[PDB]
Design a binder for this molecule. Structure first.
Ligand SMILES: N[C@@H](CSCC[B-](O)(O)O)C(=O)O
Ligand SMILES: N[C@@H](CSCC[B-](O)(O)O)C(=O)O
Ligand SMILES: N[C@@H](CSCC[B-](O)(O)O)C(=O)O
Ligand SMILES: [Cl-]
Ligand SMILES: [Cl-]
Ligand SMILES: [Mn+2]
Ligand SMILES: [Mn+2]
Ligand SMILES: [Mn+2]
Ligand SMILES: [Mn+2]
Ligand SMILES: [Mn+2]
Ligand SMILES: [Mn+2]
Lengths: 306, 306, 306
């Protein structure tokens, strides 16, 4: 199958400097030639350059870089819909997870019935209303779920975003650090998730059976994999903004990816939050980058059996 | 609920120097404001200062610092029964595991019907008759079980100790390094345990279902959680006196703690054997201390899903 | 039962220097008294000294040290069939995995109906016409399977070797790095294997149920356990020549061993590829050495339960 690669060097969804280098790190870890090695037909859109927004201040005094994030995502959305439109499976390399706003919005533009698999240590479902930090990379899901739009203040530059997917079309895997408001939202709207605790009881295998039952149980449909590198234990992925011990194992991470590929329904994938600068050493940075590449490669066919 | 915290910088239950700094390390890892963050009402008794015993030599030429250990434990037993008395859930930060003699003694003093959940790589049930090292931190359970009574030589400074719980009131989790004599006694008095193998075959959640069936199946009763940091795999908890490979996973460790909290029956908790000096680097020592806090925090409510 | 130990300090099945020090490392990690401690009757054959072959270059310009490996194996083959003959369960401590050519040949010499459990990160089933490196430690299985001999060129010094076991009498456990040609062979001859992926999905316990069904389902028969230390994750077994991430867990490896011991059919065991010189530190070397001993001890009765 054909794969498209887009580098999104964005970092204004949070305050740590360095996530804008994520794309370069992953690329330098051999992502590209690793993909043809599988046999994929490649289309590299290069690394996007987003238009900054001068004097983009706090909305209501906490939401950070609203219109800067809204514009970058609007641009990314057009490139992603373009690739998905030409039949490509879109691979977006992040910066921060706020980019999921644009990639899922651009993807949904052509595959309205898409479902989402969110692999992350966090739920990123805070709204401008419940956030404590004001950092938009922890609010992506808010602006995408239809049942939430009534409790999601509209931010400057977010005009264009239009809530698409239903709360039943997204499943979380790996949650291990959820804020109380986020927990209220997940329970209230019955959003399905499998925390590390659920994985400790059911096992990654049983977890994937179910998430696919929820999403594609009654019918085939486009799958969107938004993979946050911090979903892996910090010992496996040091180079990241918000590490949280007790994460996914290298095998589990690879198992999730392998299982998604076996569905044959992957239409778009996000690999985000890889921050080279936050690594203690050169090796730590390289370890994370390689881990990122493995997840992507494995999502497109790479096997542990050959 | 209200929580009491007692630091017992004791190290004479064994030979390595450094366990006396365990409390400070755990404290310096945020334990205190971490517990408040949960909503617990805290009463910090500070770090106790045990009275030493000059010229406290080997009894029968092997048992080490008998009277020094017997006095420190007596002493601790009173602070603990004081706290338990005022309705506090007593949290003791060790030095070595010989301290359990005091904490369980003092706790039983007010909750005679308490049951014990011992999470350790070792069973710590050697008697002064069966020990090979002579260190007392590997003999705690001996002085506490009633069925062992008459098979436990009386040492200098141990006169005050009176066997409280029965063998049927303690359950082991994590065992992987058991001496032949301990195995003989575990089998002879039918004491229940779940070795690393049992956990491998049953799953950590199936393990917790069972320990609570044995302990609190027929009735509600106070639970004493004695947690030896070496129950965790050495890669997760480096800073400790007697590492043993193939231990508990970070997740399983947290799972045990979460499950205990879910019983709502936790009265006291021991977090022992954290030895900073035994760490290779500064980060390894911090890793162990942070793991210690996560265990305690988790035992009192901290969640992986907010 | 009675056990025989044979040290094979051979390293010419590959290019890295150091594997010849594997036996000493394992021995110096307490192997011998660890086996007595179990109750086993030991017969140490010491460390063999293989006759070098001067001017033993590449056959067809790639196959490395052909006759040197062929001669070393023929000699080992006699010592092994000697021990197996006197009723001993034969334990060979490697150098490199090419030694399996000798150990399995010698073993087969008396127990023609033996079955093989191959615990390795690799399949080591490349033939002289498919290898890329030319190193013979990646081709052992080729000279042993009967259905392959037709596509296996005859090398200098291999005259004596005679294909013994059938393709259905060998099961792989832990595969996670297979070359395209190897994959073709496995599929083509229906050779059974449980890759790290199959393990993540079925669990180590289920894996063993199955391999034993394939091998000893219809009848009891001798078991040859060829255990490459690189089957363990690099974090558990650093000191080895070809590290591959996402491998067996210490607990899983010990589970495999314990399970094989439970069958009571172990005849010979290979513990290969331990290379102390590849360790970054003294401790890393010691860790790998101890792991090797545990696997052997466990395969002969050692329990995590006592
Ligand atoms: N609850 C956190 C979420 S951190 C989200 C970061 B990441 O994209 O990595 O999940 C907040 O709003 O500050
Ligand atoms: N069997 C050992 C027990 S070491 C006990 C130490 B600890 O408290 O960590 O279990 C002995 O008596 O030397
Ligand atoms: N495919 C590799 C195999 S490396 C085999 C080494 B070992 O014995 O550790 O599996 C080759 O032929 O170079
Ligand atoms: Cl603090
Ligand atoms: Cl039979
Ligand atoms: Mn995220
Ligand atoms: Mn995250
Ligand atoms: Mn202990
Ligand atoms: Mn212990
Ligand atoms: Mn190997
Ligand atoms: Mn091998």
């Amino acid at each position: 199958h054909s794969v498209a690669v887009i580098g999104a060097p964005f970092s204004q969804g949070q305050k740590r400097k360095g996530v804008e280098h994520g794309p370069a790190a992953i690329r330098e870890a051999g992502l590209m030639k690793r993909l043809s090695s599988l046999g994929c037909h490649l289309k590299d859109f290069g690394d996007l350059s987003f238009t900054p927004v001068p004097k983009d201040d706090l909305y209501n005094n906490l939401i950070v870089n609203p219109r800067s994030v809204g514009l970058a995502n609007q641009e990314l959305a057009e490139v992603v819909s373009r690739a998905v439109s030409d039949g490509y499976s879109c691979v977006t390399l992040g910066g921060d997870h706020s980019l999921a706003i644009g990639t899922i919005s651009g993807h949904a533009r052509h595959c309205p019935d898409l479902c989402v698999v969110w692999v992350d240590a966090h739920a990123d479902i805070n709204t401008p209303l419940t956030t404590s930090s004001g950092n938009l990379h922890g609010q992506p899901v808010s602006f995408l779920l239809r049942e939430l739009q009534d409790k999601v203040p509209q931010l400057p530059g977010f005009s264009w975003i239009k809530p698409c997917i239903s709360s039943a079309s997204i499943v979380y895997i790996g949650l291990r650090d959820v804020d109380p408001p986020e927990h209220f939202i997940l329970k209230n709207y019955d959003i399905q998730y499998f925390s590390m605790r659920d994985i400790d009881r059911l096992g990654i295998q049983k977890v994937m059976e179910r998430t696919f039952d929820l999403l594609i149980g009654k019918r085939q449909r486009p799958i969107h994999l938004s993979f946050d590198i911090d979903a892996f234990d910090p010992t496996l992925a040091p180079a990241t903004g918000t590490p949280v011990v007790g994460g996914l194992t290298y095998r589990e991470g690879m198992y999730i990816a392998e299982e998604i590929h076996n569905t044959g329904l992957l239409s778009a994938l996000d690999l985000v939050e890889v921050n080279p600068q936050l690594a203690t050493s050169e090796e730590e940075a390289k370890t994370t980058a390689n881990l990122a590449v493995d997840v992507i490669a494995s999502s497109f066919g790479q096997t542990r059996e050959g």
